[PDB]
Structure formats: structure tokens, C-alpha cells
């Protein structure tokens, strides 16, 4: 009835959108995309080997401190390692043990962990007495909390399989906004380096965009075949290379509102799981869903590097906040920092 | 003089890892995964002093692609019996035997037919037959044990769904594993024992597999 016609009106709005995208669609600066000078070979190999985690690693996160990175494996722990010292610093038991993603703090005093528990449990380091204690457990979703991120030690935003993306506040331990825009699932997200904007990956590749204060959508970044896995904002804050399940590191651009040149050439096996740019702004890293990972220069589309010290899936990585290191997490209880 | 501090933090690390290496076994002794309010409505038991962390994972949407793929090193996965509904289990196994990471993890099949025995009278012993033309053409097995005082059609449907399930199991794959069909034997008394035996059997199976036939 009128509902179908109204959806058709939505599709005609999409028609105007595709008109606008075509009208702003100009040729890429082919010199810089392909003809610019390359990056060259890399001899950076796994130095800090961290094999002390007792299950399949499901996440990790470099700290804004650039010192303490959490990791929430399958054995109900958040082993808060310390890359330079290579010594774990705060073991933590967890109510359940089927936890998906763990995010660390801006200051370096709160960590949060949420998996199939449905419950985002933010953890504390108030006193250095043993059996590190929970700051609080909070919930409200009805699904596995895919991934959360700290803006400020009171401002946690997360997103889960409810197709929703909530902005918890832990001053009262509740939400402030709910980003009810998605229709697939949610897998991961990254917040703008000025901690205002983000983009939400999903199952249906529609990496929507919002902002913390409002959370009102601007731009759906469609254009992936298989499925979006991981995202990270370009080191300035106007692009992000959402990885996928079809080995497509399609590096978008925020100002454009459009695609940018895709990073797909075969001899690469299924899927991506983790992406985050180095601080140079032209050395992308993307952990492919098969047993390994390869660099993808944003100026040449050449996989001029090898991340294959891993023999099973790599389910998250991240470049150091200052750009001094990047570290992946591989399923066979075996985490490494690459340098 | 952080060097003085560093050794103290190292000793703190050792007392961090003591309970870790002492619940390494606590994890290592168990096996798991049956298949909203609180998340993982864990429902567990123990046999011959050994426990086993079997649990449903209900309390979620029905989408699974990014959800089931989580479980791994989980040496038990299935329950089966579920209008056309029984096909749901069929395609579900069709999948769970082919996920790029679940291809090397086995079901322990477990039929719940006790309600179906009485449900046949409403089904008219032909609801599956109307649904499945394969049933009429299928012959009978070799070791069939139809219990006395029961409808033969019911006693044979529980033998044909076995065979279709096995057809999937040892048709699609590569050096296929063992599925392990079963049923409900009594009122929650012997099925625990049967899955325990069957899971220690598969513990044997992958123990041998990782030593590779020796």
C-alpha cells in the first residue's frame, strides 16, 4: 500500500544520493594513487612475543598511555600486559568467560569488557591491592557487546548485536544516547582522534556515522560485498579503512562521502578482521581472516609487507596511539607486537 | 631508581600468574557447548568426579554467523529435535559441519523424541512422510530395534532421520569425522551418561588425531 510507495520514496531519495555521489565523483589523483613513489620492502618482524594468554584471544587495545594494553581472551581474563616490560600487570577473573572485546582507558585507570555476557563491565584500578576489583557492571543491551570504547573515563560508547549502539555514562552507570540506526549486526567501531565522531561497522557493510553529543546519522558508507569487520579512523580524522570478509580493505574518505580505491588483489584468502593505520598515514595494516595479514600502502595499493608470524585467525590489531608499534592477536593463545 | 621498582613489579607479576597457572587445569578439565536476561544461561553437571561446562547460549537474536563462530576447542556442540521445524536442525547441521573453523569440531547428536511418540497421533504417522518423500523410498537398516508395543512408523522415523543426518555427515566433508546420533533413553538419567561416554570417545578421537594414528 502506502508503505511500499514510501519505501520507494526512500529509494528515490537514494537515487538523488547516487546523483550527488556521481556529481562529486571525480577521478582519483592517479599519480598519487598508483604512480607516486612506493613504500618499499619492510623488515619489521615480530619482536615482542606474548604467549601467556590461556585461550583464544578475542580482542586487545593499545592504551592512550601507549603502555598498558588489555586483552580479553576466552578463559575469563583481561590480561593487562605491558608491551615494553613484557610482563603482565593485573590479572582479572570475570563472572563469565565468553567475552568478546575489551577497551582500555584515556587516562589509564578504567578498562571495560563485554562479550556474550550482555553486560558491559567496566573495571577499576583504584587500589593496588590484589584480586583487581570490578568498578561496576552495567547492561541494558540484549545481545553480545561487540566492541566498546572510552572517550573519557566517564564516557563509554559501545555497540552490540541488538543492532544498537549505546553511549553509556558511568557517573550514573547508565546510557545517555542510543544510536538506533543499523539493520545488520555490529562488529567493531573506532572513535575520531578528537573523540567526537565515530563510524559503526556492521554486518550489512553500512558503516554508519554519528557523533557523540548527537548520534544523528550523516553518511552511510556502503560499498562492501561480504561483511564489515574492523574500522579505524585515518590518523587525522577524515577517513577510515573498514576491513571486510571478502579481503577488501576499502579505505573510505570522510570528506568525500564516497568510496576510495579498493585494496583487493588475489593470492589472499578469505576475509579481514582488524584494521588500523600507522601514524605515517600511508601504512595501513589489515589482518586478513585467513591465517595471516599484509600491509596495504594507501599511496600504492601494493602489499609491500608481510604479517604472517601467525598461523590462525587474527581477531584484532591496533597501531600505537603515537605510531611507534602495532600489535595483532592470533587465536592460538599467542599475541604479538610487531617491530 | 625504577629498577628497584621493576623487580617488585616482576614479583607482583609472579603472584599474578600463580592462580593463572593454577586454574589452567580448572579450565583444562572441562568440555562444553550445548545448542536476554543474563547472557549464558549456563546449565552444568558432573560425572565420576569430572565436570563438563556444557551450556546453552540462548538469550540472543537468531543470527549466528558472528556468534557461533566464537566457539572452538569445544568438543561437543549439538542438540537436535525442534509446522515445518525439523528441517531447521537439518540445515543447521549442514552448516555446523562446514564452517571454516567448526569443520574440525564435532556434534554429539541428541534426539528428543519422547514428546514426538505421543505427537504422532496428531501427526497421523505421516506428517514427516507428507513432508519427506524420501521416507517412502528408503529401506530399513540392518540393526533396527523396534521396541514391542509401539507404532512401527514411529520406530522407523527415528531410524531414517538418523540416516539422512549421517548422509550429510559422511557425505559433505574431507576425511569426515564421526557424528554420533542418539535419543532420550529415560527421564534425564541415561542421556548424561551416554553423552559422557560419547565425549570421552571423541576426546580419544582428537587425542589420536593430534598424535596422528599412532
Amino acid at each position: 500500500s502506502e508503505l511500499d510507495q514510501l519505501r520507494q520514496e526512500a529509494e528515490q531519495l537514494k537515487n538523488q544520493i547516487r546523483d550527488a555521489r556521481k556529481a562529486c565523483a571525480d577521478a582519483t589523483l592517479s599519480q598519487i594513487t598508483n604512480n607516486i613513489d612506493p613504500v618499499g620492502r619492510i623488515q619489521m618482524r615480530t619482536r615482542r612475543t606474548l604467549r601467556g594468554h590461556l585461550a583464544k584471544i578475542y580482542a586487545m587495545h593499545w592504551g592512550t598511555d601507549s603502555r598498558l594494553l588489555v586483552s580479553a581472551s576466552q578463559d575469563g581474563k583481561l590480561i593487562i600486559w605491558d608491551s615494553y616490560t613484557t610482563n603482565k600487570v593485573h590479572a582479572i577473573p570475570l563472572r563469565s568467560s565468553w567475552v568478546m572485546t575489551c577497551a582500555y582507558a584515556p587516562s589509564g585507570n578504567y578498562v571495560a569488557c563485554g562479550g556474550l555476557d550482555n553486560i558491559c563491565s567496566i573495571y577499576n584500578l583504584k587500589t593496588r591491592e590484589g584480586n583487581v576489583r570490578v568498578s561496576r557492571e552495567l547492561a541494558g543491551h540484549t545481545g553480545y557487546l561487540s566492541c566498546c570504547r572510552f572517550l573519557d573515563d566517564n564516557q563509554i560508547v559501545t555497540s552490540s548485536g541488538d543492532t544498537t549502539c549505546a553511549l553509556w555514562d558511568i557517573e550514573t552507570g547508565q546510557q545517555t544516547t542510543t544510536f538506533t540506526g543499523h539493520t545488520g549486526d555490529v562488529m567493531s567501531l573506532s572513535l575520531a582522534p578528537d573523540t567526537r565522531l565515530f563510524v559503526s561497522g556492521a554486518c550489512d557493510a553500512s558503516a554508519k556515522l554519528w557523533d557523540v553529543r548527537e548520534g544523528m546519522c550523516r553518511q552511510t558508507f556502503t560499498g562492501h560485498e561480504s561483511d564489515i569487520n574492523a574500522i579505524c579512523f585515518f590518523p587525522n580524522g577524515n577517513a577510515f579503512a573498514t576491513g571486510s570478509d571478502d579481503a577488501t580493505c576499502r579505505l573510505f574518505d570522510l570528506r568525500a562521502d564516497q568510496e576510495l580505491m579498493t585494496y583487493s588483489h588475489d593470492n589472499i584468502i578469505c576475509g579481514i578482521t582488524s584494521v588500523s593505520f600507522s601514524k605515517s598515514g600511508r601504512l595501513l595494516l589489515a589482518g586478513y581472516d585467513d591465517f595471516n595479514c599484509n600491509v596495504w600502502d594507501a599511496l600504492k595499493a601494493d602489499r609491500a609487507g608481510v604479517l604472517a608470524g601467525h598461523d590462525n585467525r587474527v581477531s584484532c590489531l591496533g597501531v600505537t596511539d603515537d605510531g611507534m608499534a602495532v600489535a595483532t592477536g592470533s587465536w592460538d593463545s599467542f599475541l604479538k607486537i610487531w617491530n | 631508581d625504577q629498577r628497584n621498582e621493576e623487580k617488585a613489579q616482576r614479583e607482583a607479576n609472579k603472584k599474578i600468574e600463580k592462580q593463572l597457572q593454577k586454574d589452567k587445569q580448572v579450565y583444562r578439565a572441562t568440555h562444553r557447548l550445548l545448542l536476554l536476561t543474563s547472557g549464558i544461561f549456563e546449565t552444568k553437571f558432573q560425572v565420576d568426579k569430572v565436570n563438563f561446562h556444557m551450556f546453552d547460549v540462548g538469550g540472543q537474536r537468531d543470527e549466528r554467523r558472528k556468534w557461533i563462530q566464537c566457539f572452538n576447542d569445544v568438543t561437543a556442540i549439538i542438540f537436535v529435535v525442534a509446522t515445518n521445524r525439523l528441517q531447521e536442525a537439518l540445515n543447521l547441521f549442514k552448516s555446523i559441519w562446514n564452517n571454516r573453523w567448526l569443520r574440525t569440531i564435532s556434534v554429539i547428536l541428541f534426539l528428543n523424541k519422547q514428546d514426538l511418540l505421543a505427537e504422532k497421533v496428531l501427526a497421523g504417522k505421516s506428517k514427516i512422510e507428507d513432508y519427506f518423500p524420501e521416507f517412502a523410498r528408503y529401506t530399513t537398516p540392518e540393526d533396527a530395534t523396534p521396541e514391542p508395543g509401539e507404532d512401527p512408523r514411529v520406530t522407523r522415523a527415528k531410524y531414517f532421520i538418523r540416516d539422512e543426518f549421517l548422509r550429510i555427515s559422511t557425505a559433505s566433508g574431507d576425511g569426515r569425522h564421526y557424528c554420533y546420533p542418539h535419543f532420550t533413553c529415560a527421564v534425564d538419567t541415561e542421556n548424561i551418561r551416554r553423552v559422557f561416554n560419547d565425549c570421552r570417545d571423541i576426546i580419544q578421537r582428537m587425542h589420536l588425531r593430534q598424535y596422528e594414528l599412532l
Partner: nanobody
Amino acid sequence: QVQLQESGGGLVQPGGSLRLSCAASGFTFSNYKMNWVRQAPGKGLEWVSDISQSGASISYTGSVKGRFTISRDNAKNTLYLQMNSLKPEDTAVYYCARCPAPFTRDCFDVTSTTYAYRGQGTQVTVSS
């Protein structure tokens, strides 16, 4: 986007002949396997068909096997389903599908109304 076009659909008597197709949008259909499904009024969706990567290991639902036929099309990048010898039990809302990734040999796609790659969906009424 990955939008799949439910080509065809309309009233037809049982025993009739039907042919519906699924149209590609933005993905390498050859690399990309696929399925079909349906859904009944008051009942969840049901897996019907598929066709593997090359076109080899085709299968169907036990309920109506042989009656209908799935086929792929690398050249025109579209899913071909021709339905013949219609039955009164097939009257339901019909949906395309895809199996999420390429490089795969299975797919977890029936989830109630909540799947991404399911197309618009046709309500093919198969009745006299």
C-alpha cells in the same frame, strides 16, 4: 549496495510453470555463492536451494525436490530459478539470499526477518 532484485512473481495455478531471478549489485557474483529461501505466513523462513561455487554440488529441499530447479549465470551475473509443476503448498512469500562470504561452502542465513543480504522478497501466490 548489495541489493538483490526479486525478478518475477505473480499469481499462478498449481501445476504451473514459473521462473524468477535474482540480480547482482556490486559484488563479484562468480566468486560468490548463493541460496534461495521462502517464508510462510505465521511460520519462519525455510531453506530451499543453493548452488555451489562452480555450479556442481546442487541440492534442494526434500519437500519439493526435483519439482523446481536452481541455476546460476556467471555471464549475466544473476540467479536463475525456474519453477515447474506447481503445488498448492508453495504459496508463500519467496526470498532470494546470499551466503555471506565468498570463498565459502556454507551459510547461516534464515534468521527471522533480520538478515542483511535477503532481497526484497516476492509474494508468489501459487494457487488456482
